[model samples]
Target: RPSRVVELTDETFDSIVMDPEKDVFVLYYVPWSRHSVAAMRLWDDLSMSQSQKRNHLTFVAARIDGEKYPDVIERMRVSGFPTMRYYTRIDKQEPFEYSGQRYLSLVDSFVFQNT
Candidate 1:
């Protein structure tokens, strides 16, 4: 498994993720959420599974903080910690939500099916 998930900070968000050419799995999370912590770990394995496919997607992570990136959290309407969304580009439409089970395998299924 990859050692970590790719970090998407306020500084880097638009340069990369908002690029029209990339499709991505971007997780929005609060630092203190237990589920978010587990997600950070699962993302390692997710990246590993993803790395194997050459599927040509970017897997990114962002922190939800009003003090730092309120634009991100508010724009995405991220009401839940550790929420995952698949994005093809910035949109007038909301990003696709992962409302199903959050187990790693289910996440793997979500990516494989959607991407």
Candidate 2:
């Protein structure tokens, strides 16, 4: 089995998610849901396969227990389980949100090789 993904809670969400140096991919999920569990399994598989690219990305598995971080769910406008959000910084601008793909794809599309 792959190593456990990093778990983020309400207390550490902002600081960790908003990190500028690393490309952030936040997986908004509930622990009990089967969909969320499947998503985690996929992430682990990818992480192990691409271990060399670890320095280029940060994968955050955030648990939305609906009790501890209700406000975060509302703030991010999350409506479903296993929602992945990609965050990255741009020159002289704020971090932007991107989704609907893998972390590598997001990095290639937005941050890398954009001259």
Candidate 3:
């Protein structure tokens, strides 16, 4: 895992994401999906390029396996793979979903815009 990306689990979700002191960008992805892998690469690029937008970002990278953690998946309402969310506060306060082209520049812009 990259220094900027933390693999999330059902046990660790709340502690890491729910009450974040930083802007939390969570990636809901399936490990085996090509789309998921591609998006992850872009996130890696973002980390290397911007380094948390001048230390103003934090995020969790999760691999959702429905057969395994249905509770977590359902709790998060992850309807699709490779879903990126910008959580700007300590709670689940209607995060900004990343729906544009999954490129490094677009992602950077999206995160900064939210900040």
Candidate 4:
């Protein structure tokens, strides 16, 4: 079985995600949202594949519990559940926003291509 999902908090979010050596993919999700749950499952599979492609990439699933990480949610301009963000050493870009479903093609295009 794959490793357990990493739950991110505001405290550890920056240190883990903003690491210069790691390419981080942060998924902002709501535990109660069906879309979020499904997206997470898909992300798990993708994370495993991505790990093989390049170990420098790291995946994180962050639960937007409304009150716990409100600032992070607002900073990312997250207006919906199951939003995904990619961060790297290139620059501090805004989080990529998505809703309803997950798309591996989009993830591959945006992330793997270094775009």
Candidate 5:
């Protein structure tokens, strides 16, 4: 069975994220931050809700531990504790960050438009 969302690390990150058929929606988070911990729940819920949508199977929801994957965190230029980004298959070189407030509906809409 496939997971609704996956946790990406330094070793497995590129393999799953650089998919030719899917878009990776990533959350870069730190465990120590309260906001990040709270956002993680919302992120999981968002992933689950989006996974059920038709024609949205290509949308891959993923989260990375900023502390564990410092290289990735640095490469992605994640200056904050909880950052949302979308990595499209067509343009895997650069990821698009979400600038709006971290609300469920707003985040859902952003994923819908991007994916």
Candidate 6:
């Protein structure tokens, strides 16, 4: 298991996400979907690699079960599986939705440039 990634639930999502000092990248997933499963693994790998660069940034890589937490996902306005969004203290109400290629390097750059 990846140590740097957070498995979020309804109880823990707001607590970690609303932190004023953290830049959070959240990947929404469902266990049964093929796309979600693949992206889930990619997210974990990305989080682990990003952890290696942790000394310089206040970034967190996290995920939640979209199917299990409809309220949370609906609040985020996410209607699809395997979606990624970047949230920051700078904007509490809206997050930057990630729509790039699902490869690790591009996704990594998205977080780096946005945060």
Estimate every model's Cα lDDT from 0 to 1: 0.65, 0.55, 0.69, 0.62, 0.84, 0.84
lDDT of prediction 3: 0.69
Tens digits of lDDT, candidate 3, 1-115: 4545656678877776666666667877777788888987877676566664465445443333444566877887878777887777654668788899988888888877876
- Of candidate 4, the 10-residue stretch with the lowest lDDT total is 56-65
Per residue, candidate 2 scores C-alpha lDDT tens digits across 1-115 of 6643456777777776676554555667777888777766666654454444444344433334533567788877778777766554432133344344545444344433321
- Please give, for residues 36-99, the per-residue lDDT of candidate 6 as tens digits: 9889888888888787774236778899999899889888888888889888768656888999
Q: lDDT of model 4 at residue 10?
A: 78
After superposing candidate 1 on the true structure, give the runs of residues whose Cα lies further than 4 Å from its correct spot: 56-68, 89-93
Give per-residue CA lDDT, model 1, range 19-49, as digits (tens).
6655566777766768787776776677677
Model 3: runs farther than 4 Å from truth? 1-3, 57-68
As a whole number from 0 to 100, the lDDT of residue 58 in candidate 3 is: 55
Query: Candidate 6: deviation at residue 17, Å?
Result: 1.1
User: In model 1, how large is the Cα lDDT of residue 24?
Assistant: 66
Off by over 4 Å in 5: 1-3
TM-score of each: 0.76, 0.65, 0.81, 0.74, 0.90, 0.90
Q: Estimate the TM-score for candidate 6.
A: 0.90
- Regions more than 4 Å wrong, model 4: 55-67, 95-101
Which lDDT tens digits does candidate 4 get at residues 57-92?
A: 454433334346877888667777667777765544
State the lDDT of candidate 5 residue by residue for 1-115, as single tens digits.
2347789988898888888788888889998999998778878888877877874778888999999899998877789888988988886787778988888799888877876
Q: Could you report the Cα RMSD, in angstroms, for every candidate shown?
A: 2.9, 4.6, 2.6, 3.1, 2.4, 1.6
